[PDB]
């Protein structure tokens, strides 16, 4: 959400207040998912600021 906090919002990417688009999602579970977990994608959970 624009201008709202969160774990991935604060520590990774926050949407700007000028965002006019739609938040569109699609289910990737039949493609990007792998057996035993998908280690290709990453995320940064913690940061100093």
């Amino acid at each position: 959400a624009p201008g709202q906090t969160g774990n991935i919002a604060d520590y990774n990417y926050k949407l700007p207040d000028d965002f006019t688009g739609c938040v569109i999602a699609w289910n990737s579970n039949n493609l990007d998912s792998k057996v035993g977990g998908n280690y290709n994608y990453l995320y940064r959970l913690f940061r100093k600021s």
Binding site: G3, Q4, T5, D17
Partner: protein
């Protein structure tokens, strides 16, 4: 002399009025709520003062 004293006195006392915000002191509002939700309270305080 009484109209200037009473005019300046009302002019100072209106700073103590809250005008619809959480508190009349800007440090308690800026030191607690986040800046995007807080900016609405600042615009109501500036418009009242």
């Amino acid at each position: 002399v009484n109209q200037n004293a009473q005019a300046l006195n009302t002019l100072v006392k209106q700073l103590s009025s809250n005008f619809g915000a959480i508190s009349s002191v800007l440090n308690d509002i800026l030191s607690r709520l986040d800046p995007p939700e807080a900016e609405v309270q600042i615009d109501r305080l500036i418009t009242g003062r």
